[PDB]
Amino acid sequence: KKRAETWVQDETRSLIMFRRGMDGLFNTSKSNKHLWEQISSKMREKGFDRSPDMCTDKWRNLLKEFKKAKHHDRGNGSAKMSYYKE
């Protein structure tokens, strides 16, 4: 069921951060088994006890909504970005 502790801005925002950053990989590497593992552990280390399975499920939904091909596509905000090399 739905327990007290749930996805909070802190985590949510973070989850995307770790991803958006290591995204270029997900594309190259077919199997994102590691990425998902490293991420879960990373975002968790900060101080949030959460499982990887959840991060994957939640992420999937987050995208579905983000998609610009939905019945209701009114309410999105864009922003410039920057790239660099380690």
Short mmCIF file of N, CA and C in Angstrom, two decimals, residues 2-86:
data_model
loop_
_atom_site.label_atom_id
_atom_site.label_comp_id
_atom_site.label_asym_id
_atom_site.label_seq_id
_atom_site.Cartn_x
_atom_site.Cartn_y
_atom_site.Cartn_z
N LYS A 2 0.22 2.42 0.07
CA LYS A 2 0.93 3.69 0.08
C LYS A 2 1.30 4.09 1.50
N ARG A 3 2.57 3.91 1.85
CA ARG A 3 3.05 4.26 3.19
C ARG A 3 3.37 5.75 3.28
N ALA A 4 3.66 6.21 4.49
CA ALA A 4 3.99 7.61 4.71
C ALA A 4 5.11 8.06 3.78
N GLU A 5 6.33 7.61 4.07
CA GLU A 5 7.49 7.97 3.26
C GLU A 5 7.22 7.73 1.78
N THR A 6 7.47 8.75 0.97
CA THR A 6 7.25 8.65 -0.47
C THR A 6 8.24 9.52 -1.24
N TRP A 7 8.14 9.50 -2.56
CA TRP A 7 9.02 10.29 -3.41
C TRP A 7 8.88 11.78 -3.11
N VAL A 8 9.98 12.40 -2.68
CA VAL A 8 9.98 13.82 -2.36
C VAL A 8 10.79 14.62 -3.37
N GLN A 9 10.49 15.91 -3.49
CA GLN A 9 11.20 16.77 -4.43
C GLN A 9 12.70 16.49 -4.41
N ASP A 10 13.28 16.49 -3.21
CA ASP A 10 14.71 16.23 -3.06
C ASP A 10 15.13 15.02 -3.88
N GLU A 11 14.55 13.87 -3.58
CA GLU A 11 14.88 12.64 -4.29
C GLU A 11 14.55 12.77 -5.78
N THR A 12 13.27 12.93 -6.09
CA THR A 12 12.83 13.07 -7.47
C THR A 12 13.83 13.88 -8.29
N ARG A 13 13.97 15.16 -7.95
CA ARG A 13 14.90 16.03 -8.65
C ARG A 13 16.26 15.37 -8.83
N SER A 14 16.76 14.76 -7.75
CA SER A 14 18.05 14.09 -7.79
C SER A 14 18.05 12.97 -8.82
N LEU A 15 17.16 12.01 -8.65
CA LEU A 15 17.05 10.88 -9.57
C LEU A 15 17.30 11.33 -11.00
N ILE A 16 16.60 12.38 -11.41
CA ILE A 16 16.75 12.91 -12.77
C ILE A 16 18.16 13.44 -13.00
N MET A 17 18.71 14.10 -11.99
CA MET A 17 20.06 14.66 -12.09
C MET A 17 21.07 13.57 -12.44
N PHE A 18 21.10 12.51 -11.64
CA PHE A 18 22.02 11.40 -11.88
C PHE A 18 21.82 10.81 -13.27
N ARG A 19 20.57 10.73 -13.70
CA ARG A 19 20.24 10.18 -15.01
C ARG A 19 20.67 11.14 -16.12
N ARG A 20 19.97 12.26 -16.22
CA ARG A 20 20.27 13.26 -17.24
C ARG A 20 21.78 13.39 -17.44
N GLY A 21 22.53 13.17 -16.37
CA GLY A 21 23.98 13.27 -16.45
C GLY A 21 24.61 12.04 -17.08
N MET A 22 24.14 10.87 -16.69
CA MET A 22 24.66 9.62 -17.23
C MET A 22 23.75 9.07 -18.33
N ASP A 23 22.98 9.96 -18.94
CA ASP A 23 22.06 9.57 -20.01
C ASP A 23 22.84 9.09 -21.23
N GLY A 24 23.77 9.91 -21.70
CA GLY A 24 24.56 9.55 -22.86
C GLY A 24 24.95 8.09 -22.87
N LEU A 25 25.03 7.50 -21.68
CA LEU A 25 25.40 6.09 -21.54
C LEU A 25 24.22 5.19 -21.90
N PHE A 26 23.12 5.35 -21.18
CA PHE A 26 21.92 4.55 -21.41
C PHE A 26 21.73 4.29 -22.90
N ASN A 27 22.05 5.28 -23.72
CA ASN A 27 21.91 5.16 -25.17
C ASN A 27 22.95 4.19 -25.73
N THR A 28 24.22 4.49 -25.51
CA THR A 28 25.30 3.65 -25.99
C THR A 28 25.16 2.22 -25.48
N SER A 29 25.19 2.06 -24.16
CA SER A 29 25.06 0.75 -23.54
C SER A 29 23.61 0.28 -23.56
N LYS A 30 23.35 -0.81 -24.28
CA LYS A 30 22.01 -1.36 -24.37
C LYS A 30 21.45 -1.68 -22.99
N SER A 31 22.15 -2.54 -22.26
CA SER A 31 21.72 -2.93 -20.92
C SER A 31 22.17 -1.90 -19.89
N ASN A 32 21.21 -1.20 -19.29
CA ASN A 32 21.50 -0.19 -18.29
C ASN A 32 21.43 -0.78 -16.88
N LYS A 33 21.87 -2.03 -16.75
CA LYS A 33 21.85 -2.71 -15.46
C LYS A 33 22.75 -1.99 -14.45
N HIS A 34 24.00 -1.76 -14.84
CA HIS A 34 24.95 -1.08 -13.97
C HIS A 34 24.46 0.33 -13.63
N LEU A 35 24.31 1.16 -14.65
CA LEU A 35 23.85 2.53 -14.46
C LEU A 35 22.76 2.60 -13.39
N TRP A 36 21.74 1.76 -13.55
CA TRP A 36 20.63 1.72 -12.60
C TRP A 36 21.13 1.38 -11.20
N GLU A 37 22.09 0.47 -11.12
CA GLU A 37 22.66 0.05 -9.84
C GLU A 37 23.45 1.19 -9.20
N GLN A 38 24.43 1.71 -9.94
CA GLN A 38 25.26 2.79 -9.44
C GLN A 38 24.41 3.97 -8.98
N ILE A 39 23.42 4.33 -9.79
CA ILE A 39 22.53 5.43 -9.47
C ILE A 39 21.82 5.20 -8.14
N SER A 40 21.04 4.12 -8.07
CA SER A 40 20.31 3.79 -6.85
C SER A 40 21.21 3.91 -5.62
N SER A 41 22.41 3.36 -5.72
CA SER A 41 23.37 3.41 -4.62
C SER A 41 23.81 4.84 -4.35
N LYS A 42 24.05 5.59 -5.42
CA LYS A 42 24.48 6.98 -5.30
C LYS A 42 23.41 7.83 -4.62
N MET A 43 22.25 7.94 -5.26
CA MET A 43 21.15 8.71 -4.71
C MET A 43 20.81 8.26 -3.30
N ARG A 44 21.02 6.98 -3.03
CA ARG A 44 20.73 6.42 -1.71
C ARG A 44 21.78 6.86 -0.69
N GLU A 45 23.05 6.77 -1.08
CA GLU A 45 24.14 7.16 -0.19
C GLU A 45 23.84 8.51 0.47
N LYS A 46 23.40 9.47 -0.33
CA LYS A 46 23.08 10.80 0.18
C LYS A 46 22.35 10.71 1.51
N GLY A 47 21.36 9.82 1.58
CA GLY A 47 20.60 9.65 2.81
C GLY A 47 19.15 9.29 2.54
N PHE A 48 18.92 8.50 1.50
CA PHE A 48 17.57 8.08 1.14
C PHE A 48 17.53 6.58 0.83
N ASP A 49 16.99 5.81 1.77
CA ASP A 49 16.89 4.36 1.60
C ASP A 49 15.78 4.01 0.62
N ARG A 50 16.15 3.70 -0.61
CA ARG A 50 15.19 3.35 -1.64
C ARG A 50 15.73 2.25 -2.55
N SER A 51 14.83 1.43 -3.08
CA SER A 51 15.22 0.33 -3.96
C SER A 51 15.32 0.80 -5.41
N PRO A 52 16.10 0.06 -6.22
CA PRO A 52 16.29 0.38 -7.64
C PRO A 52 15.03 0.15 -8.46
N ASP A 53 14.34 -0.95 -8.18
CA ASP A 53 13.12 -1.29 -8.90
C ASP A 53 12.16 -0.11 -8.92
N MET A 54 12.01 0.54 -7.78
CA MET A 54 11.11 1.69 -7.67
C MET A 54 11.59 2.84 -8.55
N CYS A 55 12.89 3.11 -8.51
CA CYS A 55 13.47 4.18 -9.31
C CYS A 55 13.19 3.97 -10.79
N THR A 56 13.21 2.71 -11.22
CA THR A 56 12.96 2.37 -12.61
C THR A 56 11.50 2.59 -12.98
N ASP A 57 10.60 2.09 -12.14
CA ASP A 57 9.17 2.23 -12.37
C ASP A 57 8.76 3.70 -12.38
N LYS A 58 9.14 4.43 -11.33
CA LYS A 58 8.82 5.85 -11.23
C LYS A 58 9.33 6.61 -12.44
N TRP A 59 10.57 6.33 -12.83
CA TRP A 59 11.18 6.99 -13.97
C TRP A 59 10.35 6.79 -15.23
N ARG A 60 9.95 5.55 -15.48
CA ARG A 60 9.15 5.22 -16.65
C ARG A 60 7.91 6.11 -16.73
N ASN A 61 7.18 6.21 -15.63
CA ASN A 61 5.98 7.03 -15.58
C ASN A 61 6.31 8.50 -15.83
N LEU A 62 7.38 8.98 -15.19
CA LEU A 62 7.80 10.36 -15.35
C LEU A 62 7.95 10.72 -16.83
N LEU A 63 8.49 9.79 -17.61
CA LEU A 63 8.69 10.01 -19.03
C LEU A 63 7.35 10.05 -19.77
N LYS A 64 6.54 9.02 -19.57
CA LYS A 64 5.23 8.94 -20.21
C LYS A 64 4.51 10.29 -20.14
N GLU A 65 4.53 10.91 -18.97
CA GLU A 65 3.88 12.20 -18.78
C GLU A 65 4.64 13.30 -19.52
N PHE A 66 5.96 13.25 -19.46
CA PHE A 66 6.80 14.24 -20.13
C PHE A 66 6.54 14.25 -21.63
N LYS A 67 6.37 13.06 -22.20
CA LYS A 67 6.11 12.93 -23.63
C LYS A 67 5.22 14.06 -24.13
N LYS A 68 5.54 14.60 -25.30
CA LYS A 68 4.77 15.69 -25.89
C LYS A 68 3.66 15.14 -26.79
N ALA A 69 3.46 13.83 -26.74
CA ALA A 69 2.43 13.18 -27.55
C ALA A 69 1.33 12.59 -26.66
N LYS A 70 0.74 13.43 -25.82
CA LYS A 70 -0.32 12.99 -24.92
C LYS A 70 -1.57 13.85 -25.10
N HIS A 71 -2.71 13.32 -24.67
CA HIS A 71 -3.97 14.05 -24.78
C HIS A 71 -3.83 15.48 -24.27
N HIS A 72 -3.28 15.62 -23.06
CA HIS A 72 -3.08 16.93 -22.46
C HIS A 72 -1.61 17.32 -22.48
N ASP A 73 -1.23 18.15 -23.44
CA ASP A 73 0.15 18.60 -23.56
C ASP A 73 0.26 20.10 -23.31
N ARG A 74 -0.45 20.58 -22.29
CA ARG A 74 -0.44 22.00 -21.95
C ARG A 74 0.09 22.21 -20.53
N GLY A 75 1.38 22.53 -20.43
CA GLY A 75 1.98 22.75 -19.13
C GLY A 75 3.40 22.22 -19.05
N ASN A 76 4.27 22.75 -19.91
CA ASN A 76 5.67 22.32 -19.94
C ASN A 76 6.60 23.53 -19.98
N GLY A 77 7.77 23.39 -19.35
CA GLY A 77 8.73 24.47 -19.33
C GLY A 77 10.10 24.04 -19.82
N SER A 78 10.63 24.76 -20.81
CA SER A 78 11.93 24.45 -21.37
C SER A 78 13.01 25.35 -20.79
N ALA A 79 14.26 24.91 -20.88
CA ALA A 79 15.38 25.68 -20.36
C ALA A 79 16.68 25.28 -21.05
N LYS A 80 17.52 26.28 -21.34
CA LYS A 80 18.79 26.04 -22.00
C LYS A 80 19.64 25.05 -21.20
N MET A 81 20.68 24.52 -21.84
CA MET A 81 21.57 23.56 -21.19
C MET A 81 23.02 23.80 -21.61
N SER A 82 23.94 23.13 -20.93
CA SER A 82 25.36 23.27 -21.23
C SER A 82 26.07 21.92 -21.16
N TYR A 83 27.09 21.75 -22.00
CA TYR A 83 27.84 20.50 -22.04
C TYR A 83 29.32 20.75 -21.75
N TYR A 84 30.03 19.70 -21.38
CA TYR A 84 31.46 19.80 -21.07
C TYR A 84 32.10 18.42 -20.99
N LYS A 85 33.42 18.40 -20.85
CA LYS A 85 34.16 17.15 -20.75
C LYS A 85 34.85 17.03 -19.40
N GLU A 86 34.79 15.84 -18.81
CA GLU A 86 35.41 15.59 -17.52
C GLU A 86 36.81 16.21 -17.46
#
